[PDB]
Amino acid sequence: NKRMSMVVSGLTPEEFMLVYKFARKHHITLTNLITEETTHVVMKTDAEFVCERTLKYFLGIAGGKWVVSYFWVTQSIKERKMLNEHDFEVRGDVVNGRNHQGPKRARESQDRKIFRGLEICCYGPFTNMPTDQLEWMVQLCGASVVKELSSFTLGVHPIVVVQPDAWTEDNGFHAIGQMCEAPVVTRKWVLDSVALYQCQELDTYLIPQIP
């Protein structure tokens, strides 16, 4: 068959303790780390099921998982039965829309992933989110991962993604355009697209380039 596997995000230790005891009572696989076997992401939300954007949130959508509210856990406890978590699926986030229903979109749109036919190179550096995690995100959304600017397949459409904050001693993010004929955009492009599960126009996110 197939087994329920949850991870949590936005929870405090004491809250985690609740989900742990909860997962123990009901025999639900609980883990530290999101993988392909992961079925549900349990998000801390407000009473309307809006959450903060965390890596686990992005990855839970990218993978088309059930991103449900931590209110499911508390409410199931309160009624001594496990409630249907579909009734608690996360509706939105404090950034992209309080009701954009990105989780539902990705869940129903696995056949038409948002990054089909796109080659993305995550041109480092980055912070608060490891380059391989950003890379896995795009892939899960149907993107093709290019390690090097040279590795761009010529003939698909290419996109270089950077986080200009991370650039310590460089304005070098304006030089990228030189070393390859491709659009350059901030990480917020990837993120905004994944949360809404809709591929954003690049115009807003483009980084000025020097020829």
Partner: peptide, 7 residues
């Protein structure tokens, strides 16, 4: 939580 947020 300690997990990084993106806003």
């Amino acid at each position: 939580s300690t997990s990084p947020t993106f806003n």
